């Protein structure tokens, strides 16, 4: 229910307005991300153990720090509004990744003719 | 009078148009001679084809050429514009504008100098000085 | 002159080697025949008289297939030079009006005699001379009288004389067949306001002249290029006014009263409607019973009206 | 984020559906013929356009694979797209129309003797 | 400042302007800047391999850049990822185009170069498509595609799928054929234009050039055998 | 990410003055008037000429030696890099034993003036001129055969000698 | 089979050649051995005539100078039937093993002697 | 192919042909388009066949003759590259870049 | 793209002269872009004043190249030839006045109310969209992402020179104006320090297997002749494989994608042009305007259509 993906008509840095409450919206997005991906596809896959662990790491640094600036210098991304914008779409990415199940075997073997260039 | 004012219309397709607008630059100015080009094929006299000439362009070029009054000349500015030039071996290039429009003064080379374009212009005006149209009404 | 397989090739610059020379050719008919002639790889010497009018015949071919020489029918040496190197030569020549320096004589009689004398002095194979329709030796249109004299002179010397007599022609920028229909401020003439004859389309004239100018076994025959079917009168003006403007407005003036405009015509900067045209308005196609046509040279020339739909259609109302 | 005359690219599977789709394409491509004659001012008539369009589709009546017929459908609908407005010009447009004979003169009667 | 150019204050200098010595350009290394980055990038490719093992084929690393081989029927789920992951925040595409090698039965490899913004890191992604069968576009993900894939279609006839306005840009509008296929040569089939008799109808012919492109058919013994390098 | 409210205190009615009458725009008029007084830059091209560097490219004049035996040897290196294939050569053993050019052909229709011909003819026999002496009315007056190029080198080698003697220790 | 993107009538008219490029006899070196070549013939009336103005050789073949470089002969021929025109394949010719004792410089009773 | 001529030009300063297959006839050279033209279009090659007979033979009492052709005013190397030729039999006096004749004496 | 695919590196003289030539080329490109832009907008004087020193930059090509604007001067193996002396002496005296005249053309466009309603928040392209459009270069940095290639993937000695990159704040055409007008007075610093730091060394590549021999000893040596001969007959050997290389041309990121056979000639070359991507983005940008808006928004995104294909 977090409608603070991106705001409207305020003046932040690069053509994307400033969200009002970035910490509660972001911690709700991390909670929803952990609720979706963990309960859909198995913990065997490296993809879950990567997205999940990075998600918990970001969750830790958000839930610890207070201002919207120290969280930047620890998060390794750009602006915190843009951190929220980034943090939106992996929820929908894992949500799509429910479908087209990638942790299965490789569905196609090319003929090995296709991957020959020279020598 | 025809030799004095002498304005073209830009057709101006490529690099050779960059040298054409260098003739409008202050170093080798057009307006010290009278060359004040309009962007309109009826108000024009001569039609400088500059740049290479695609296969795709050429009907538009001949349609521009036809809506142009009768004392008309054509300058082929640039090697590509005459005898196809540096491409000449494309599927999509026209091997010289001699396949499209009749030309009265050629101008050689990829991009010819602003010097070169003005030298071609003075050679065209030197041709104008031998037009002898009134005494050709008298049938000399 | 001896050659290889036939005329019609399938690609430009697969060049022939036939070296032609076309007189006139700046104006009306000589556009399309050298357009058909340089299209298929033949060297053309086209002489001219006006420098600014010769330009639009250059783009028909690319290289060596169009050349300019500065002829003039006064100068013997110019025409002498003009067909030194030629192989075939046609002359479409002759204004439809006298100039301020030319008679109707010696624009296709002694003008023809000079160039045919150059032909005989150069042994040029395949001399083709166009001449007018209705080319009699009678007076009434001294144009026609002079064309009959010209055919007589071209048969006096040079038995290599393929004379061709086209009808009134029909093409883009028709000098006095459709320009007096298209612009037509008040087309007013023809005391006999009907009773003309055969029209022939111009590209069919050019195809006839092309298919005569290369094949042999046609030396000294004379051709007349008949209209395909209709041989129609000035009622085609009505079909011209089938286009919605109907501005044609023929006012059918008296004959001797019409002379004054023609006598005005000699004073003007530009030619208008000189009186041998007015006299030819009293004539018709005195069609030769024995002259080979499009059916002999294996062509079928196109009809009038459906071609006129294409040919006059800038000039509609909406 | 736009179109020009709703060019869609989505090849179906079944050959019946591709049949119906080419059929509706043929209807629009045939219906636009007086619009073509208006737009380009040809000499010939609208039935000449119609018999040549029919000729062009009879050129590929007996093509087997639907997975060739897909890109043939794309070529057809795409040249309809470039004909329904004034992208093509009449010099570009006459490349479908071997109209006149008199350009050629006498030529090959498809005999061996007159190859020589 | 002052004292710059003309209307001169009579002050200038074209003297004593030198550094005279003998050069000391001590170097031999062709490509050693990249080896730490290549060792990082192997491991990054191993991450992408283990993360999405269904849809990917073998990675291929070369000289500080990266190329992912992808089965062609499934590209859209790959590029929902890898554009738009947190750890792979690329979001900026720089090239889609095609390359024929008409050796193999599949004929046209289709090559994508993508660009990161947060990470300053390029990537390449390849599929293989035949003239017969299409591969889907990537215009569903972003809007920078629908021009480039027109360019790909025009140069090749690599037909696409799921895409609006698959027109021609890069050729003439009545021109069939596809140029960057190595089928038809430089001259093209019909490329002439002339306009004399059938007036202004600049209609083509069989393109008969004035001097043919006399080729380059020389070849020496053998170029080189590569000094391989991998992290592992 | 500078927040930069910037609501108030830009000016105190001076803002209405600068907006109201065109002071910022009258400034540009004063600039172009001050530019009006200064020097022009036209070069009367029939009578004067722009700067011609020695490495500038021209019309392909063939050099010969001192007492020149037609310095081109048809070595074909200037063929194999003309990037529009504007070079067509044919060669033969001439009567006196050496090899010479039977014909030498430059499509000045399609000479890009890359100078690679000059950068590779080892005896330095084809040379880009500095002369812009051109503007023929036919293509048939552009297709330079051997005689045009030998004539063009015979018309000037003075200028070419100046050019090489400022360039050949850099080529 | 209909051609999808081949506007010529090449596919019914000409004979094309699949050939291994021959080993040149002048140089030693064998890089032309490791290709396969597609080449259209010049069996033509067009067939590179002579110009008359400058004297180049203006051809009439729109596809005179064209070479594919393939990998395998059967991949070559699967392409050649896929795009579908009449071919002719040409088998290469190897060089046969012959044992070369450098010591071939010894005789019995025999007339002829060499360097 | 017909009868016409304009006697105003031989081949060059040398009278006959310069080499094998370099003709000087004009009718085969398409006399159609030489007309109305000066003949003072450029016959400027002096046919370097004549210019070796201009050149005097140089003598070297060694056995190997160096040839450069480069000037002694140019700052850069401009002559043909350093071919070493032999002067051994009389007759082979031919630097194949310049045609300067080197005889052993 | 080629010398990356050769595993060679041009010496330091070559990198500095290609960098300074890249930045006078950058001055030339942004100058002609702003001039043609302002001519389409309507002012004629900035166009002609800018071409007045474009003619001096034409000479600075001409004293190096063989022509005025086109040049075969860069090679894969470095460049063609070292500079002449009076060029390097003169180019300082040029750059002495170019900042003053750049201010002179700057004073009558940047400040006026025309260009302030003639250019407003017009053609606003957000960064979320601009990354999704395949835009680059000046429009990208106008949309406020401090990213180019030169400071971020430093080819050819931009590493070694103090180079500051302007960043937009609003994604309109006005910051796309002002970011070019800042890149002028950033490139002039580069011409300054490349006039200072110019070393002495080989300006081609060091060996002669790959580019060209020196023309002095190509007439005193066997090996120099065989390298000269094969370098102009068969080109040269290139190792096989792919590469892609992008630099920020002054119109945006130009990419070159080259698949080399392992032979004399490139098996595939695909260019990549900002004038082919920005043109592709044009429809998404142009909506909700008028036609005299669209004339300016052509010239902002550097639509010189000789970089389409
Ligand atoms: N009503 C008609 O017009 C008909 C035409 N014909 C015949 O067809 C022939 C060609 O028709 P068309 O194409 O309209 O002719 P044109 O209107 O094109 O004129 C012929 C060209 O030859 C030039 N010319 C040649 N000799 C002279 C000369 N002594 N004096 C002045 N000008 C000369 C003319 O002017 P310039 O010197 O300036 O180039 C003109 O350019 C005509 O001669 C006619 O006999 C037959 C049936 C109907
Ligand atoms: S003639 Fe030269 S300058 Fe003009 S477009 Fe062609 S290549 Fe460019
Ligand atoms: S200057 Fe360039 S285009 Fe001209 S002939 Fe020499 S290499 Fe070819
Ligand atoms: S490079 Fe030299 S030897 Fe070779 S063809 Fe040209 S002039 Fe003759
Ligand atoms: Zn010598």
Domains of chain I, each with CATH number or no CATH: 1-301 (1.10.645.10)
With contact defined as beta carbons under 8 Å apart, do C148 and C136 qualify?
Answer: yes
Measured CA to CA, the distance from residue I222 to residue I206 in angstroms comes to: 18
Diameter of chain D by CA atoms? 61
Which residues, in sequence order, are CB contacts of I220 under 8 Å at separation 6+? H77, H81, H82
Measured CA to CA, the distance from residue B86 to residue B77 in angstroms comes to: 13
| CA F111 – ligand 3 centroid, Å | 5
Taking alpha carbons only, the member of A97, B81, I73 closest to residue E54 is: A97
Taking alpha carbons only, the member of C276, C155, C177 closest to residue C221 is: C155
Which tokens belong to F37? Answer: 């007084």
Which residues, in sequence order, are CB contacts of C314 under 8 Å at separation 6+? none
Which residues, in sequence order, are CB contacts of F127 under 8 Å at separation 6+? F60, F61, F62, F63, F118, F153, F160, F163, F164
How distant, in Å, are the alpha carbons of C74, F154, H23 from that of D19? 74, 74, 68
Please report where in the chains the tokens 């490791």 appear, as a residue. G34
DSSP conformation letters of chain E = ----SSS--S----SS-------------SS-SSHHHHHHHHHHHHHHHHHSTTTEEEEEEETTEEEEEE-TT--HHHHHTTTS-SSS---EEEEEEEEE-TTSSS-EEEEEEEE-SSS--EEEEEEEE-SSS----STTT-SSSTTHHHHHHHHH-----S-S-----SS-TT--S-TTSSSS-TT-SS-----SSSTT---------SS---------S-----------
Measured CA to CA, the distance from residue C84 to residue C123 in angstroms comes to: 10
Strands E122-129 and E108-115: antiparallel
Helix (H) or strand (E) holding I281: helix I274-286
Which residues, in sequence order, are CB contacts of C32 under 8 Å at separation 6+? C171, C202, C203, C205, C206, E196, E197
As a whole number of Å, the end-to-end CA separation of chain G is 64
HSE value, Cβ hemisphere, 13 Å, CA-based, for A71: 22
Measured CA to CA, the distance from residue I79 to residue I96 in angstroms comes to: 26
Residue A15 φ/ψ region, left for φ over 0, alpha for ψ in the -120 to 50 degree band, beta for the rest: left
Taking alpha carbons only, the member of B126, B119, B115 closest to residue B22 is: B115
Measured CA to CA, the distance from residue C125 to residue C160 in angstroms comes to: 7
Q: Which ligand is nearest to the CA of B116?
A: 2
Ion ligand 5 residue ranges (Cβ < 5 Å) = H 67, 69, 80, 95, 97-98
Angle between helix axes I12-41 and I45-62 (nearest 10 degrees) is 160
Residue H76 φ/ψ region, left for φ over 0, alpha for ψ in the -120 to 50 degree band, beta for the rest: beta
Which tokens belong to H19? Answer: 């080499």
Q: What is the dihedral of CA F151, F156, F160, F161, to 10 degrees?
A: 120
Domain ranges of chain D: 1-116
With contact defined as beta carbons under 8 Å apart, do C292 and C163 qualify?
Answer: no
Measured CA to CA, the distance from residue E3 to residue E9 in angstroms comes to: 7
Which tokens belong to A1? Answer: 């229910």
With contact defined as beta carbons under 8 Å apart, do F88 and F96 qualify?
Answer: no
Does the Cβ of F68 fall within 6 Å of ligand 3? no
Strands F99-107 and G15-19: unpaired
How distant, in Å, are the alpha carbons of B29, C173, I50 from that of B25? 6, 43, 9
Residue H50 φ/ψ region, left for φ over 0, alpha for ψ in the -120 to 50 degree band, beta for the rest: alpha
Which tokens belong to B120? Answer: 């071609």
How distant, in Å, are the alpha carbons of A31, C15, E33, F38, I56 from that of C1? 98, 16, 77, 74, 63
Measured CA to CA, the distance from residue C112 to residue C89 in angstroms comes to: 12
Please report where in the chains the tokens 């400022």 appear, as a residue. F166
Residue D103 φ/ψ region, left for φ over 0, alpha for ψ in the -120 to 50 degree band, beta for the rest: alpha
Which tokens belong to H71? Answer: 């000037």
Taking alpha carbons only, the member of C112, C87, C100 closest to residue C24 is: C112
CA-based torsion, C242, C243, C246, C249: positive or negative: negative
With contact defined as beta carbons under 8 Å apart, do I18 and I172 qualify?
Answer: no
Please report where in the chains the tokens 């999509």 appear, as a residue. B92
CA D51 to chain centre: 10
Q: What is the dihedral of CA A103, A109, A114, A116, to 10 degrees?
A: 80
Residues of D in Cβ contact (< 8 Å) with B58: 91
DSSP conformation letters of chain C = ----S-S--SSTT-----EEEEES-SSSHHHHHHHHHHTTS-EEEEE-S-GGGSGGGSTTSSSSS-EEE---TT-HHHHHHHTSS-SEEEE----SS--SS--STTTSSHHHHHHHHHHHHHT-S-EEEE--TT--SSSSSHHHHHHHHHHHHHHHS-S-EEEEEE-SEESTT-TTTTHHHHT-S-----SS-S-----EEHHHHHHHHHHHHH-SS-TT--EEE--SS----TTHHHHHTTSTT---------HHHHHHHHHHHTTSSS----HHHHHHTT------SS-B-TTTTT--PPPSHHHHHHHS-S----
Measured CA to CA, the distance from residue G36 to residue E104 in angstroms comes to: 13
Q: Say how many C-beta atoms besides its own lie within 10 A of residue E198's C-beta.
A: 19
Residue B107's beta-bridge partner residues?
B77
CA angle C40-C46-C49, nearest 5°? Answer: 155
Among 3.40.50.300, 3.50.50.60, 3.40.50.720, 3.10.50.40, what is the CATH number of C1-315?
3.40.50.720
Measured CA to CA, the distance from residue C102 to residue C112 in angstroms comes to: 14
Phi, psi of E70 (to 5 degrees): -130, 135
Residue E100's beta-bridge partner residues?
E108
Phi, psi of H92 (to 5 degrees): -85, 25
DSSP conformation letters of chain G = ---SS--SSHHHH-EEEEEPPPPPSSS---GGGG--EEEE---SSSS----SSS-------TTSS--EE-S-HHHHHHHHHHTT-EEEEE-----------S-----SS-S----
Please report where in the chains the tokens 């400071």 appear, as a residue. I151
CA angle I284-I290-I292, nearest 5°? Answer: 110
Taking alpha carbons only, the member of C95, C107, C90, C115 closest to residue C32 is: C90
Please indicate if the annotation marks C55 as binding a ligand: no
With contact defined as beta carbons under 8 Å apart, do G73 and G89 qualify?
Answer: yes
Pocket test for ligand 4, best of F80, F119, F121 (most atoms within 8 A of CB): F121
d(CA G67, nearest CA chain E) in Å: 9
Which tokens belong to C77? Answer: 């040496």
Helices (H), strands (E): how many in chain F? Answer: 5, 5
As a whole number of Å, the end-to-end CA separation of chain H is 55
Pocket test for ligand 2, best of B11, B52, B81, B116 (most atoms within 8 A of CB): B52
> Inter-chain contact E163–D9, Cβ cutoff 8 Å?
yes
Which residues, in sequence order, are CB contacts of A41 under 8 Å at separation 6+? A47, A48, A97, A98, A101, A103
With contact defined as beta carbons under 8 Å apart, do C7 and C211 qualify?
Answer: yes
Which tokens belong to E141? Answer: 């993900």
With contact defined as beta carbons under 8 Å apart, do G70 and G76 qualify?
Answer: yes
Side by side, which strands form the sheet with F99-107? F87-93, F99-107, F143-144
SS3 A60: helix
With contact defined as beta carbons under 8 Å apart, do C141 and C96 qualify?
Answer: no
Strand segments, DSSP code E, in chain D are none
Phi, psi of C122 (to 5 degrees): -105, 0
Q: From the CA of C131, give the closest atom in ligand 1.
A: 45
Which tokens belong to E193? Answer: 């234009």
CA-based torsion, F157, F159, F162, F168: positive or negative: negative
Helix (H) or strand (E) holding B105: strand B105-107
CA H22 to chain centre: 13
Q: Which of the residues I130, I167, I268 would you substitute to probe the E interface, choosing the one with the greatest number of E C-beta atoms within 10 Å?
A: I268
Measured CA to CA, the distance from residue C88 to residue C51 in angstroms comes to: 24
Which residues, in sequence order, are CB contacts of I70 under 8 Å at separation 6+? B15, B110, B111, F112
Measured CA to CA, the distance from residue I188 to residue I161 in angstroms comes to: 12
Q: From the CA of B52, give the closest atom in ligand 2.
A: 5
Residue E62's beta-bridge partner residues?
E65
Strands G86-90 and G15-19: parallel
Measured CA to CA, the distance from residue B30 to residue I253 in angstroms comes to: 35
HSE value, Cβ hemisphere, 13 Å, CA-based, for C196: 24
SS3 I299: helix
Residue B54's beta-bridge partner residues?
B93
Q: Say how many C-beta atoms besides its own lie within 10 A of residue E59's C-beta.
A: 17
DSSP conformation letters of D85-105 = STTS-HHHHGGG----STTS-
Measured CA to CA, the distance from residue G44 to residue C17 in angstroms comes to: 20
Which residues, in sequence order, are CB contacts of F7 under 8 Å at separation 6+? none
Measured CA to CA, the distance from residue I171 to residue I55 in angstroms comes to: 32
With contact defined as beta carbons under 8 Å apart, do H34 and H5 qualify?
Answer: no
CA angle H32-H35-H37, nearest 5°? Answer: 140
Measured CA to CA, the distance from residue D24 to residue H97 in angstroms comes to: 75
Measured CA to CA, the distance from residue C288 to residue C246 in angstroms comes to: 35
Side by side, which strands form the sheet with B105-107? B46-50, B73-77, B105-107
Strand segments, DSSP code E, in chain I are 74-75, 78-79, 241-249, 252-260, 266-272
The DSSP symbol for I254 reads E
Measured CA to CA, the distance from residue G8 to residue G3 in angstroms comes to: 10
Resolution to 1 decimal, in Å? 4.3
Measured CA to CA, the distance from residue E82 to residue E125 in angstroms comes to: 10
Method underlying the structure: cryo-EM
Which residues, in sequence order, are CB contacts of G13 under 8 Å at separation 6+? none
> Inter-chain contact F139–C64, Cβ cutoff 8 Å?
no
Does the Cβ of F81 fall within 6 Å of ligand 4? no
The DSSP symbol for H35 reads T
Q: Say how many C-beta atoms besides its own lie within 10 A of residue C216's C-beta.
A: 10
Residues of I in Cβ contact (< 8 Å) with B21: 51
Measured CA to CA, the distance from residue B52 to residue B79 in angstroms comes to: 8
Measured CA to CA, the distance from residue B58 to residue E174 in angstroms comes to: 14
Determine contact: E221 vs chain F, CB below 8 A. no
CA I196 to chain centre: 21
Residue G57 φ/ψ region, left for φ over 0, alpha for ψ in the -120 to 50 degree band, beta for the rest: beta
CA G47 to chain centre: 18
Which tokens belong to E109? Answer: 């490899």
Strands E65-70 and E56-62: antiparallel
Domain ranges of chain C: 1-315
Taking alpha carbons only, the member of B76, B68, B74 closest to residue B43 is: B68
Residue C23's beta-bridge partner residues?
C91
DSSP conformation letters of F64-129 = --TT-S-S----STTTTT-TT--EEEEEEE-TTSSEEEEEEEEETTS-----HHHHH-TT--EE--
Which residue of chain F has the CA closest to I109?
A: F28
Q: Name the residue facing D92 among E143, E163, E172 (closest C-beta).
A: E172
Which residues, in sequence order, are CB contacts of B140 under 8 Å at separation 6+? B132
Three-state secondary structure string covering C152-164? HHHHHCCCCEEEE
| CA F109 – ligand 2 centroid, Å | 11
Please report where in the chains the tokens 């070292």 appear, as a residue. I82
């Amino acid at each position: 229910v977090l409608v603070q993906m991106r705001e409207g008509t305020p003046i932040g840095l690069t053509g994307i307005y400033q969200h009002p409450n970035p910490r509660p919206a972001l911690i709700a997005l991390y909670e929803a991300t952990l609720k979706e991906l963990q309960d859909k596809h198995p913990k065997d896959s490296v993809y879950r153990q990567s997205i999940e662990n990075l998600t918990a790491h970001r969750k830790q640094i958000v839930e610890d720090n207070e201002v919207s600036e120290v969280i930047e210098n620890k998060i390794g991304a750009g602006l915190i509004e843009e951190v929220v914008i980034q943090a939106h779409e992996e929820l929908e990415l894992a949500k799509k990744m429910s479908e087209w199940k990638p942790w299965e075997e490789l569905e196609e073997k090319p003929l090995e003719d296709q991957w020959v260039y020279f020598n | 009078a025809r030799q004095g004012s002498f304005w073209p219309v830009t057709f101006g397709l490529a690099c050779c148009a960059v040298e054409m607008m260098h003739v409008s630059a202050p170093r080798y100015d057009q307006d010290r001679l009278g060359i004040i080009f309009r962007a309109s094929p009826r108000q024009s006299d001569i039609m400088i084809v500059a740049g290479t000439l695609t296969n795709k362009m050429a009907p538009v070029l001949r349609q521009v050429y036809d809506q142009m009054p009768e004392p008309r000349w054509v300058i082929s500015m640039g090697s590509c514009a005459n005898g196809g030039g540096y491409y000449h071996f494309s599927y999509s290039v026209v091997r010289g504008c001699d396949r499209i429009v009749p030309v009265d003064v050629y101008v050689p080379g990829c991009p010819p100098t602003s010097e070169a374009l003005m030298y071609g212009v003075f050679q065209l005006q030197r041709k104008m000085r031998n037009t002898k149209i009134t005494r050709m009404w008298y049938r000399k | 002159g001896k050659t290889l397989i036939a005329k019609g090739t399938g690609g430009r610059s697969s060049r022939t080697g036939y070296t032609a020379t076309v007189f006139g050719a700046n104006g009306f008919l000589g556009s399309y025949l050298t357009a058909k002639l340089a299209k298929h790889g033949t060297t053309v010497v086209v002489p001219y008289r006006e420098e600014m009018a010769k330009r639009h015949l250059k783009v028909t071919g690319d290289l060596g297939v169009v050349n300019f020489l500065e002829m003039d029918l006064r100068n013997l040496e110019s025409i002498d030079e003009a067909v030194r190197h030629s192989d075939i030569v046609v002359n479409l020549i002759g204004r439809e009006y006298e100039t301020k320096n030319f008679n109707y004589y010696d624009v296709h009689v002694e003008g023809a005699r000079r160039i045919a004398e150059a032909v005989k002095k150069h042994n040029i194979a395949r001399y083709i001379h166009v001449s007018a329709f209705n080319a009699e030796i009678d007076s009434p249109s001294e144009f026609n009288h002079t064309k009959g004299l010209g055919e007589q002179v071209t048969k006096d010397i040079v038995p290599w004389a393929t004379i061709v007599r086209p009808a009134p022609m029909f093409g883009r920028e028709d000098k006095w067949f459709l320009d007096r229909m298209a612009r037509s401020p008040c087309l007013v003439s023809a005391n006999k306001f009907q009773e003309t004859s055969n029209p022939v389309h111009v590209i069919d004239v050019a195809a006839a002249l092309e298919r005569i100018c290369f094949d042999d076994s046609t030396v000294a025959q004379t051709f007349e290029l008949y209209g395909p079917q209709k041989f129609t009168q000035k009622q085609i003006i009505d079909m011209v006014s089938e286009t919605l403007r109907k501005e044609v407005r023929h006012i059918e003036l008296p004959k001797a009263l019409y002379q004054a405009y023609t006598k005005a015509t000699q004073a003007i900067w530009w030619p208008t409607y000189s009186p041998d045209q007015v006299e030819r308005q009293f004539l018709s196609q005195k069609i030769d019973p024995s002259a080979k046509t499009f059916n002999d040279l294996d062509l079928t020339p196109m009809e009038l009206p459906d071609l006129m739909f294409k040919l006059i259609r800038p000039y509609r109302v909406n | 984020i736009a179109t020009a005359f709703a060019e869609t690219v989505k090849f179906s599977g079944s050959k019946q559906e591709l049949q119906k789709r080419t059929l509706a394409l043929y209807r629009q491509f045939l219906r636009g013929a007086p619009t073509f004659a208006d737009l380009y001012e040809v000499q010939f008539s609208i039935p000449t356009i119609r018999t040549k369009i029919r000729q062009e589709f009879e050129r590929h009546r007996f093509v087997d694979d639907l997975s060739i017929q897909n890109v043939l459908y794309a070529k057809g609908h795409m040249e309809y797209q470039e004909c329904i407005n004034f992208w093509k010009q009449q010099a570009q447009f006459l490349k479908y129309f071997p109209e006149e004979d008199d350009i050629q003169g006498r030529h090959q009667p498809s005999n061996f003797v007159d190859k020589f | 400042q002052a004292a710059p150019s003309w209307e001169n204050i009579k002050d200038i200098r074209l003297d004593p302007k030198v550094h005279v010595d003998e050069v000391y350009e001590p170097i031999v290394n062709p490509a050693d800047r990249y080896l730490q980055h290549v060792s990082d990038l192997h491991q990054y490719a191993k991450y992408i391999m283990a993360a999405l093992p269904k849809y990917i084929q073998g990675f291929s690393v070369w000289k500080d850049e990266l190329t992912l081989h992808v089965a062609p029927s499934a590209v859209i789920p790959v590029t929902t990822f890898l554009r738009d992951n947190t750890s792979t925040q690329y979001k900026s595409i720089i090239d889609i185009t095609a390359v024929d090698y008409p050796s193999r039965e599949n004929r046209f490899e289709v090559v994508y170069n993508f660009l990161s913004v947060r990470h300053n890191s390029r990537i390449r992604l390849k599929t293989y498509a035949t003239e017969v069968t299409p591969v889907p576009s990537i215009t569903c993900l972003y809007e920078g595609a629908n021009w480039f894939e027109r360019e790909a279609y025009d140069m090749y006839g690599v037909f696409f799928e799921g895409h609006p306005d698959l027109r021609r840009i890069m050729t003439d509008y009545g021109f069939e054929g596809h140029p960057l296929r190595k089928d038809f040569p430089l001259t093209g089939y019909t490329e002439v234009r002339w306009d004399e008799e059938k007036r202004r109808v600049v209609y083509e012919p069989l393109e008969l050039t004035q001097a043919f492109r006399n080729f380059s058919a020389g070849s020496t013994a053998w170029e080189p055998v590569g000094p391989g390098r991998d992290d592992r | 990410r500078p927040a930069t409210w910037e609501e108030s205190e830009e000016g105190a009615l001076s803002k209405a003055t600068k907006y109201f009458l065109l002071a910022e725009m009258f400034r540009g008029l004063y600039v172009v008037l001050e530019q009006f007084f200064r020097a022009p830059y036209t070069i009367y091209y029939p009578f004067e000429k722009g700067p011609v560097s020695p490495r500038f490219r021209g019309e392909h004049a063939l050099r010969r030696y001192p007492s020149g035996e037609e310095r081109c040897i048809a070595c074909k290196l200037c063929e194999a890099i003309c990037p529009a294939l504007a070079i067509t050569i044919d060669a033969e053993e001439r009567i006196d034993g050496s090899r010479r050019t039977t014909k030498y052909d430059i499509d000045m229709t399609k000479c890009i003036y890359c100078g690679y011909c000059q950068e590779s003819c080892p005896v330095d026999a084809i040379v880009e001129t500095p002369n812009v002496e051109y503007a023929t009315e036919t293509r048939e007056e552009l297709l330079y055969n051997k005689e045009k190029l030998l004539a063009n080198g015979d018309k000037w080698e003075l200028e070419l000698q100046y050019a090489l003697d400022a360039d050949a220790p850099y080529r | 089979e209909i051609v999808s993107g081949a506007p010529a009538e090449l596919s019914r008219n000409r004979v094309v050649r699949i050939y291994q490029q021959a080993k040149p006899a002048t140089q030693s070196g064998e890089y032309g051995t490791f290709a396969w070549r597609l080449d259209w013939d010049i069996v033509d009336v067009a067939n590179r005539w002579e110009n008359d103005l400058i004297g180049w050789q203006s051809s009439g073949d729109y596809m005179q100078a064209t070479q594919m470089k393939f990998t395998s002969k059967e991949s070559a021929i699967k392409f050649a039937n896929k795009q579908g025109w009449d071919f002719y394949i040409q088998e290469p010719h190897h060089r046969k093993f012959r044992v070369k004792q450098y010591a071939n410089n010894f005789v019995h009773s025999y007339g002829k002697l060499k360097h | 192919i017909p009868e016409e001529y304009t006697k105003q030009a031989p081949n060059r300063d040398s009278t006959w042909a310069p080499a094998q297959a370099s003709k000087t006839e004009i009718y085969k050279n398409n006399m159609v388009r030489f007309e109305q033209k000066d003949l003072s279009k450029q016959p400027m090659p002096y046919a370097g066949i004549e210019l070796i007979a201009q050149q005097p033979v140089r003598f070297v009492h060694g056995n190997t003759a160096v040839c450069d052709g480069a000037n002694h005013n140019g700052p850069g190397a401009q002559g043909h590259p350093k071919i070493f030729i032999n002067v051994d039999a009389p007759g082979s006096h031919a630097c194949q870049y310049c045609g300067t004749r080197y005889e052993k004496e | 793209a080629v010398e990356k695919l050769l595993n060679v590196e041009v010496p330091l003289r070559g990198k500095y002269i290609r960098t300074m030539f890249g930045e006078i080329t950058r001055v030339l490109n942004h100058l002609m872009s702003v001039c043609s832009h302002a001519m389409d907008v309507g002012a004629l004087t900035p166009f002609l004043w800018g071409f007045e020193e474009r003619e001096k930059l034409m000479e600075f090509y001409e004293r190096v190249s063989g022509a005025r604007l086109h040049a075969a001067y860069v090679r894969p193996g470095g460049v063609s030839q070292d500079l002449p002396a009076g060029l390097l002496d003169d180019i300082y005296m040029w750059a002495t006045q170019f900042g003053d005249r750049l201010d002179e053309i700057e004073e009558l466009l940047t400040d006026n109310r025309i260009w302030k309603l003639r250019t407003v928040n017009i053609g606003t392209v957000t960064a979320q969209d601009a990354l999704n459009l395949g835009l680059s270069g000046p429009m990208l940095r106008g949309s406020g992402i401090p990213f180019d290639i030169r400071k971020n993937a430093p080819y050819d000695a931009y590493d070694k020179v103090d180079f500051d990159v302007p960043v937009g704040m609003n994604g309109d055409c006005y910051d796309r104006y002002l970011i070019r007008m800042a890149e002028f007075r950033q490139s002039l610093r580069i011409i300054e320090q490349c006039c200072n730091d110019m070393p002495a060394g080989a300006v081609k590549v060091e060996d002669f297997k790959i580019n060209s021999p020196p023309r002095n000893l190509m007439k005193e040596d066997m090996e120099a002749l065989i390298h000269h001969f094969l370098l102009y007959t068969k080109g040269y050997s290139v190792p096989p494989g792919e590469t892609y290389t992008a630099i920020e041309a002054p119109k945006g990121e130009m990419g070159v994608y080259v698949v080399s056979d392992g032979s004399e000639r490139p098996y595939k070359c695909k260019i990549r042009a900002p004038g082919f991507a920005h043109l592709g983005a044009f429809d998404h940008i142009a909506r909700g305007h008028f036609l005299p808006d669209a004339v300016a928004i052509i010239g902002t995104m550097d639509l010189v259509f000789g970089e389409v294909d």
